[PDB]
Amino acid sequence: GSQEVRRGDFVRNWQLVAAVPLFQKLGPAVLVEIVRALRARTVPAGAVICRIGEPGDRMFFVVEGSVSVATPNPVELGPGAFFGEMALISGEPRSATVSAATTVSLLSLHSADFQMLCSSSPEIAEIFRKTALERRGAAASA
Ligand SMILES: Nc1ncnc2c1ncn2[C@@H]1O[C@@H]2COP(=O)(O)O[C@H]2[C@H]1O
């Protein structure tokens, strides 16, 4: 364990998780366990966060900044948004390539932590499937 002046990273993650209500649906011991499982990591512009084809084994949540999807008809993502749950939702490969348009701070969640947190809250699992369906399709498939 490096850098331990006064759990500054853990404190920042607390406030970071506070920016996400999805994590608020988790109990106290769950949210605390999810916080100790999740880590805040910033991706520099041009840094690929997700690559189509690659298997998703972690989640991503934008805290500050915007992101751009790698495709012919991508979209602009902002803070308070989550992505890369479709894989952790089912296991399918990156539905599309994700690339941070600029330096944005996001949090990382373990696949095991995702299934454990989803097990804690059945609503969070439904919210994920809703986004997975929307992200996966919900327009074409239909
Ligand atoms: N149209 C879209 N808008 C926002 N996010 C998307 C869109 N399409 C795909 N994604 C995200 O790209 C991610 C690729 O990894 P996942 O499939 O696990 O989860 C996918 C979605 O969260």
Swiss-Prot record:
3',5'-cyclic AMP binds at G84, E85, R94, S95, R135. Residues 3-142 are cytoplasmic. It is found in: Cell membrane. It comes from the Bacteria. Homotetramer. Cyclic nucleotide-regulated potassium channel activated by cAMP. Belongs to the potassium channel family. This is Cyclic nucleotide-gated potassium channel mll3241. It comes from Mesorhizobium japonicum (strain LMG 29417 / CECT 9101 / MAFF 303099) (Mesorhizobium loti (strain MAFF 303099)).
